[PDB]
Amino acid sequence: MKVRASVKRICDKCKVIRRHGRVYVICENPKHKQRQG
Amino acid sequence: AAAKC
Amino acid sequence: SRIGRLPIPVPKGVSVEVAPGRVKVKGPKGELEVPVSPEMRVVVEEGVVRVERPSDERRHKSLHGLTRTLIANAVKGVSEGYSKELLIKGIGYRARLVGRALELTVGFSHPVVVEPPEGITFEVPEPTRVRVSGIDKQKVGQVAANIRAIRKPSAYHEKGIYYAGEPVRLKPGK
Amino acid sequence: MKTYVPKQVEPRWVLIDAEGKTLGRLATKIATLLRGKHRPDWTPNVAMGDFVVVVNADKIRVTGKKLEQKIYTRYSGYPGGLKKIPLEKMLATHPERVLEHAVKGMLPKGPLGRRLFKRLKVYAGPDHPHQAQRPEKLEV
């Protein structure tokens, strides 16, 4: 998981979701997982 | 207290 | 392009009685209770069950899709049933069946035994194949996930407990 | 001429059911009754309100996410002595304290306000032990 203030889609398979008041980026590539924090 | 300088 | 507008082609042997906030489904396999939001109307007609929504804003469009699929899952469950198949891979790893409980030999220093919950049945056709069966789709998925969490698939080897149809993705280790 | 001063009067016993009421909006009405401000002869320096009996206090209703977010705090006077209790835990363990705490904060501070709090009787469940006083049911 990458935790940073600037979360963005890194590749065309990246997906942006919102669960429990937080923005997440989830992707098939495990390196692309992100949390806004 | 003592020397305060 | 919708989910909640399609009626449910209920087959015979399955009886659904609507109730305030609930939908009671009875079939040859068992009975299920499906709590439905009172903010919506469920109506049962000849061989069909259809759900309508009372407005067109975001919340009612969201519950319309949710309400139909859960009911359709319940009606399907009591007619045909639900199952999930687990694969056990690795040279020494295998499974067997103790009475009703299931036995896992997955490379720990001890065996791992799982007691099935009420409404769930286990099947071991092969030592490297486990089936979980029941009438509740949510419980079938949950129990299957519980067993898979005992020994998750490895990231470097084709070893562990896998879902049926789950692809195997490895990385080099040398 | 001088303003009318009432003489002492036997007080009224009142019964309130808290089933499904919003906590804060019920507590306001209780505090007004305890102060006796519904009486044309109200006097600020005497205790002349009603005795209030509340039943079904455990079935009070709260809006939003206050069940998990509202925190009661107690300070013991020791280092690290601040204790925090969420509302849902208070409802489970001491249901009567929730409505008691809300009303107490809405009463005047001082000796008279402390006496007025003594005239409130809160019970979880539908029964109360004050049948001798015969409280008349009031709709809130």
Binding site: - | - | - | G77, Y78, P79, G81
Partner: protein, 204 residues
């Protein structure tokens, strides 16, 4: 959950499997049942036990009527064992077998007004190198203007001991029903002759 009242007799050691075992001897039996506490009447379950029989000329009327209701001779000590309901009207040392673990409660010896070095194991001050009349003193008790006060529970000199103390998970070494004697491994609070309570341990 089961218990009995007793008196600390003394300390010795015995030999077992070529090992020396330090033991405390306790005279425990017998304890007549005087009153039973029930949830219907009292709100909890307990049994009130009696110990150390007393000369009737020293028993006043309220206690004599209390003893007469149970049909027992007057004793000196009345104590409750929480969550215990003995089968009979008398409790003896037989309730315990060797190898069982027990908790023992007593009143520790009283040290009176004790200093911080004895009561709290404070380091004290130096004994040379200019130290001026502060050898057994506590040192600083606070900070400056913030917070400008001393915390509650600050460790200071005061009364020490003569208080209730429980030692847990002591092994029962031997039971001697002829002389109503119980042998436990190790040390027990209080002086010889002091009242103690022996209960089944809460550990596991």
């Amino acid at each position: 959950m089961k218990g009995i009242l007793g008196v600390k007799v003394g300390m010795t050691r015995i030999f077992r499997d070529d090992r020396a075992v330090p033991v405390t001897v306790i005279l425990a039996g017998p304890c007549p049942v005087v009153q039973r506490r029930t949830p219907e009447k009292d709100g909890y379950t307990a049994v009130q036990l009696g110990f150390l029989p007393q000369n009737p000329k020293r028993v006043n009327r309220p206690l004599k009527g209390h003893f007469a209701k149970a049909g027992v001779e007057p004793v000196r000590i009345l104590r409750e064992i929480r969550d215990f309901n003995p089968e009979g009207d008398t409790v003896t040392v037989e309730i315990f077998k060797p190898g069982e673990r027990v908790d023992v409660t007593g009143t520790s010896k009283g040290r009176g007004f004790a200093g911080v070095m004895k009561r709290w194991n404070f380091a004290g001050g130096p004994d040379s190198h200019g130290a001026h009349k502060i050898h057994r003193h506590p040192g600083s008790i606070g900070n400056r203007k913030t917070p400008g006060r001393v915390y509650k529970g600050k460790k200071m000199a005061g009364h020490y001991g003569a208080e209730r103390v429980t030692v847990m998970n002591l092994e029962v070494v031997d039971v001697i029903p002829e002389e109503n004697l119980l042998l436990v491994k190790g040390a027990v609070p209080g002086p010889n002759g002091g009242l103690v309570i022996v209960r089944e341990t809460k550990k596991a």
